[PDB]
């Protein structure tokens, strides 16, 4: 009963991260930010990061949230879009609203680290 376990553990996270990128890369609000991104790299880092954040194994060796988005001057509407797409991903994968909300509540603490950097 970590959030990572409630979502379904490793095979669930490996399905969810590429589906979340499929939605992000179709969302007019944010897709363009990824134009020059190595999507294999990025899928791996984000899988490691959400796995760590949500109480699974901690193998995240990437940048902190300010460094990751430095120079992007991200705005609130961009962060809302990312949360909406992760929520829609987990809902499409059959996750209940209560578990989506627990996950979102953890991720939402990162907003101040990345906006306006
Ligand atoms: C606010 C809207 C956001 C936008 C537009 C965005 C966009 C990006 C982009 C474009 C990169 C890659 C730069 C590159 O390597 O090509 C990146 C890195 C990353 N972002 Fe975001 N991001 C956002 C929010 C989030 C959130 C909410 C999280 C997780 C909670 C997240 C986690 C990460 C991670 C783990 C990396 C990888 C850092 C590394 O490579 O070491 N981001 N982001």
Question: What do these coordinates show?
Answer:
The protein is mostly helical and 117 residues long. The chain has one domain: Globins (Globin-like). The chain is built from seven helices and no strands. The longest helix is centred in the C-terminal third of the chain and has 17 residues, at 76-92. The structure holds protoporphyrin IX containing FE. Protoporphyrin IX containing FE (HEM) binds next to α3 and α5. Monomer. Keywords: Acetylation, Heme, Iron, Metal-binding, Oxygen transport, Transport.
Give the beta-strand count. 0
Q: Superfamily at the CATH H level?
A: Globins
Ligand types: protoporphyrin IX containing FE
**Topology-level CATH name:** Globin-like
- The sequence of SSEs as H and E is HHHHHHH
The top-level CATH class is Mainly Alpha
- End-to-end distance, in Å? 34 Å
Instruction: Characterize the biggest β-sheet.
Output: none
- Structural class by sheet pairing and helices: mainly alpha
Shape: globular
- Assess the beta-strand content as a share of residues: under 5%
Corresponding CATH architecture? Orthogonal Bundle
Summarize the amount of helix as a percent range: 55-70%
Summed up, the helix count is 7
